[PDB]
Paper text:
Bovine respiratory syncytial virus (bRSV) is a member of the Paramyxoviridae family that is responsible for the majority of respiratory disease in cattle annually, resulting in considerable morbidity and losses approaching $1 billion per year. bRSV is genetically and antigenically related to human RSV (hRSV),2 which is responsible for over 3 million hospitalizations for severe respiratory illness in young children and the elderly each year and for which no licensed vaccine is available. The pre-F form of RSV F is metastable and spontaneously undergoes structural rearrangements to the post-fusion (post-F) form, which no longer presents epitopes for many potently neutralizing antibodies. Here, we use a combination of structure-based design, antigenic characterization, and X-ray crystallography to translate human RSV F stabilization into the bovine context.
Upon expression in Expi293F cells only three of the seven bDS-Cav1s (strains 391-2, ATue51908, and RB94, respectively) expressed at greater than 0.5 mg/l of culture. The crystal structures of two pre-F-stabilized bRSV F immunogens, ATue51908 DS-Cav1 and DS2-v1 were determined to 2.65 and 3.50 Å resolution, respectively. In this crystal form, the appended C-terminal foldon trimerization domain was visible in the electron density map, although its threefold axis was tilted by ~17 degrees relative to the threefold axis of bRSV pre-F due to crystal packing. Comparison of the two bRSV pre-F-stabilized structures at the backbone level revealed high-structural similarity with an rmsd of 0.9 Å between 434 equivalent Cα atoms excluding the F2F1 linker region. The greatest structural differences between the hRSV and bRSV pre-F immunogens were observed in residues 206–215 at the apical loop between α4 and α5 near antigenic site Ø, which is also the region of highest sequence divergence (only ~50% identity) between the two species. The three DS-Cav1-only immunogens which also had the least number of mutations had the highest affinity for D25. Although none of the DS-Cav1-only immunogens were able to antigenically survive exposure to 70 °C, consistent with that observed for hRSV F pre-F-stabilized immunogens, all three of the DS2 immunogens tolerated exposure to high temperature.
Author numbering:
A (entry chain B), B (entry chain C), C (entry chain A): 26 to 98, 138 to 544
The structure:
């Protein structure tokens, strides 16, 4: 349940209410370390089958370290940020001398530790893979300085399992130029990520939201490769901070609104263009025009403020009265009376124009409604699909309450003779100004062409003097 | 097969013909189940290596079922659908009481069966993995209860292969929020997909088309995670239904058409904006403006009707007569005099404007044609690359038949003084309408200048009498 | 690497300079091969644990081979190319009789060989996996004709590792319809790709650039599945050729520029539309509007000319005098008085409008500057974050040298009463022509209102002669 939808016949637009916000407002970065036992390329040449599997698996280990070494060497009008600017900024700190040793010394006896860097930022540091101890204690002593021996075959399988994670990380960074998203299992496992969330400087509400939407947290996180230095692989994990949680959100759907009475392509159209996600935020409204950068899990909407606009609350007035005087509502105009459909949360908006067939069908009953020329709406209660032309759209089967708000389509208030049908992105006031301006020039020019009757024309230019008499020019010499 | 291409010099456009349709018109959903053995939260914990490897593999099995458990908790005037709405509606029914048991009982004796759900929808279900059997029969008995013996090392290797597909399925769903596309081979293998196509309620032509294009079917398919209930993982696979097959298709290529005789930046430009794929469909024409949403295999075109517009058959007149009165062909206008090229199916359109070098080369003979200012066309016969400015274009090496259709460029019909060169998405009639209102804006000024000529200004005010002589006021006393 | 940046207050734009070019000019095609040991179902029925593992792994081998067989059978005005046209043409030649044998013979004695195809092109050829020798010499002897025995368990692990690369190649090709990008390490490992780079027909400077930026090469390369015939799997790897290196490059950032003097939506807005990358190339300027099609690695900028426009050197005049007469600078107009921010290389542009709170902060001192209404700029020296409304932007901490160039906002030169705020993609000269047509209609109408106020009305019609005196008609007979 939980969802309600309002359809406005007057503006061919629908609003779905009942969603809860989870907006990413900031970032939080932690450094992930992997201890290494580097070089020791002195191969002992005992050609036993188990020894060459360990050695050829040791090469994969050497290649993984070298690969990572070579690495450290209304959609418009929005803002343009840098998503990994915060995470790249801490990779710059790890390049300084002694900083790697600072975190290496703090992780001497524990897997997790907070390290204060020279930049004045205390960063969480932890270690996920300990290949240094397994190689130098369970493999190399049996191999390097004890006459080249591998006793059991399980040590081969055990070594390729502990090495597998290092190979996948190098493999994932190599095909993403050192920056990966989403944060994969190999970069950070589920238990590790749950542990990191539990230790972040965030609220209990933020910890609870992240721990129950880990898969969404991954899609909004980055992994940034920093340095391979002093037998340590360090990469930064950039986690999202949801500073705005549990505020109401609603999505606006729009569809073309045209006249159905003019002849052929003489019909005019208008469409609201401010579609996307809206959420209350700090007395204002955040607008997310690109619906693709928002993830919806049940009634919870995960959006990024980097792809948002701050708007005043008066923007909601466009839903109920598009001609309001507190906010100028954005629209676009055209003459293309083409049919289309928009699938909403719990219904469908259908714009039927021309000879196009537009219907709404049911899996057990068949076609249950044939739309007439105009912009109509239907909910998912009883309907399962909608057809417009040769396009079959399935309808979301989420249960909710739909409200049909009747009203006169606003396109009928405009005269097609003076209607600017070439506005890609205008507004109500701009359309009114363009009509006021053109009708003023027509009115003013006609008032001048009629106000030039009764004025005297030029007299003959023949070197003679002329006086005025009976509406004509007469020679002055005639009167003397 | 035999692809032909006609280049229309009059509109700087080309139409590639000879293609056959394969239009996705609907969806087919099926339920995929994986039988699980219930989690033994803490099995034996020995120090034997083979038991250790088995123990670590059981943990990965447990982590995969937990990660899936926490998971169930001209294209701007197109319609907006919900491509996954049909599959998600099936996931809803599976959450209901006993619906998972209804399929679990229907799949005890067969790897596949049709199940009638409470929603009245009969869906095809099938069992895809054999893990509950391999564990409880060959691995768990010699390890559960009060035992801890892993006999052969082959059971360690065999369990890794059995369990690998499950880890990979859980791995994809975790980094995709439970909705993946394309349909990977872990979600459905090649032999399982061929088996599901052979059992779909479709004709033999449709089964044959899907079978020889399994790669494309995956590109237009989805995998949707539903539930983890009663020791079985159920997810839905959403398969495409190609209801329109073997109808002719053609592709339209367009390029800027500018004058070359005007001076500096006074040249006017025009461009057809209806690029994309067209296919006959139920007495109408389906238009796909986003070429990236279509896939081409030999002479077959796989498009999705969701990203299409349903147009009348009269839209074809825009290739033979762009000024026809039956259909208003879409164009855009501009002033920019810049060069570009359009790689077509068996040739290349070149728009050379300004002081830019435009070239057609052969890899063995070098430059073989230097284009002049204007819009020209060249086929791939003896041509390997095209060069426009600083960009090198490779041409397609598909053999075909190219027909050059001579004709006057329609940009020469327009007077530059009244040409509206700022239309982002207009049409032929909309430009003529703006030309009409611009000419009326000129003849209005010509009707006021012809109505003021000959009128006389006021004579000097100085207490003297003035007559009219030679277009000037002369004192009356001068003639006394 | 000295990176500098100038902020142009007049146009609300910044230009970051100091980068070096690496432009993808052409393509290079190489053929990668897998030697197969096709193909036997003759599986002897000895049910040994080690033999059954080889049976299952042999079936996976057979499945991958069969799975690959079914595979063989401002940016809206840019040009349209075929990105893999050159790679597909090489696949075409590999279908010809004997072409695969030519490659297979060239690879009998070496893993890398140059082969001359029948179309004249000499192509590097790489054999990356030799499963034919391993199966027929190490595995099949003791099975096919030696009474069905698997001796050691190391041949089970060794064959699984060798077959692993073939499986991943088939899986990656199966979910990408035989065309993949970026180039994964399964299709080409780091050393194999390096081996191909340094044997290409390119200079040493191009070899060094690609060799030290292997991860970028993968992001700009394609793998194309060609053929599976004569026990060989062949796919073409299409690699970039960087024909233009080390030339200067600069990026342009633009932000909306609005008046702040009017009330509510009475203000007008202007924005430069030519944001993106620019580089010098052969005496012109290559422009890359889609910033996502360029990759930056420290000082270097890797762009693709296919997504570029070749512009004259006069385009730089838009940065110094946007009202120049040589090059017409493109802009867009609106009435949207909305706030946003653009993060640049070493700073941040802030467009603050309305009642929005705009702020630049430091991690140690908090807010250090509060922007006022208008378009302002701040550098990363001392600034870590910028807040515009409810959005937080982290700034890039790259050390550089920023220059603030004071200048009058060009949005102030326009009269809002005649300003066309409905231009999605116009230019300085195009909007001056629309203003010129409205101002000439206002200039002429006022030149007539004052001209009719000085015209003389008709004299009395009473058969008497009149002369003009003191602005009145008086009788000529009075002066007799
Ligand atoms: C222009 O708008 C004003 C303000 O409402 C109105 O008084 C006037 O009549 C309008 N002019 C025309 C020609 O519509
Ligand atoms: C332009 O005017 C002519 C003559 O007045 C008329 O025949 C034609 O239909 C008009 N075109 C448009 C698009 O209004
Ligand atoms: C506008 O008109 C003036 C003269 O009335 C002319 O000098 C100017 O060049 C015109 N503007 C443009 C952009 O042509």
């Amino acid at each position: 349940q939980n969802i309600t939808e309002e359809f406005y016949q007057s503006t061919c637009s629908a609003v779905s209410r009942g969603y809860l916000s989870a907006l990413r407002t900031g970032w939080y970065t932690s450094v992930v370390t992997i201890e290494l036992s580097k070089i020791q390329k002195n191969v002992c040449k005992s050609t036993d089958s188990k020894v060459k599997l360990i050695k050829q698996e040791l090469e994969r280990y050497n290649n993984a370290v070298v690969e990572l070494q070579s690495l450290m060497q209304l959609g418009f009008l929005l803002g343009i940020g840098s998503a990994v600017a915060s995470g790249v900024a801490v990779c710059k700190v790890l390049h300084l001398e002694g900083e790697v040793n600072k975190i290496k010394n703090a992780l001497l006896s524990t897997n997790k530790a907070v390290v204060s860097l020279s930049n004045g930022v205390s960063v969480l540091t932890f270690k996920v893979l300990d290949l240094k101890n397994y190689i130098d204690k369970e493999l190399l002593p049996q191999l390097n300085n004890h006459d080249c021996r591998i006793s059991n075959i399980e040590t081969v399988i055990e070594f390729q399992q502990k090495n597998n994670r290092l190979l996948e990380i190098a493999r994932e960074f190599s095909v993403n130029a050192g920056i990966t998203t989403p944060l994969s299992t190999y970069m950070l496992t589920n238990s590790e990520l749950l542990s990191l969330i539990n230790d972040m400087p965030i609220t209990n509400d933020q910890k609870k939201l992240m721990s129950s939407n880990v898969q969404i947290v991954r899609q909004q996180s980055y992994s940034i490769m920093c340095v391979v230095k002093e037998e340590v692989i360090a990469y930064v994990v950039q986690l999202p901070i949801y500073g705005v949680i549990d505020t109401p959100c609603w999505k606006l759907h729009t569809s073309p609104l045209c006249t159905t009475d003019n002849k052929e392509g003489s019909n005019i159209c208008l469409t609201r263009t401010d579609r996307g996600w809206y959420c209350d935020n700090a007395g204002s409204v955040s607008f997310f025009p690109q619906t693709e950068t928002c993830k919806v899990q049940s009634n919870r909407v995960f959006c990024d403020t980097m792809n948002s606009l701050t708007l005043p609350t008066d923007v909601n007035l466009c839903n109920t009265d598009i001609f309001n005087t507190k906010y100028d509502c954005k629209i676009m105009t055209s003459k293309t009376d083409i049919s289309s459909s928009v699938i909403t949360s719990i219904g469908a908006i259908v714009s039927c124009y021309g000879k196009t067939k537009c219907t709404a069908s049911n899996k057990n009953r068949g076609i249950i409604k044939t739309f007439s020329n105009g912009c109509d709406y239907v909910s998912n209660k009883g309907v399962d699909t909608v057809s417009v032309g040769n396009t079959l759209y399935y309808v979301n089967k989420l249960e909710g309450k739909a409200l049909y708000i009747k009203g006169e389509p606003i396109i009928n208030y405009y005269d097609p003779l003076v209607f600017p049908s070439d506005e890609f992105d205008a507004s109500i006031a701009q359309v009114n100004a363009k009509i006021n301006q053109s009708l003023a020039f027509i009115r003013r020019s006609d008032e001048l062409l009629s106000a030039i009757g009764g004025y005297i024309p030029e007299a003959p230019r023949d070197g003679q003097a002329y006086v005025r008499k009976d509406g004509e020019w007469v020679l002055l010499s005639t009167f003397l």
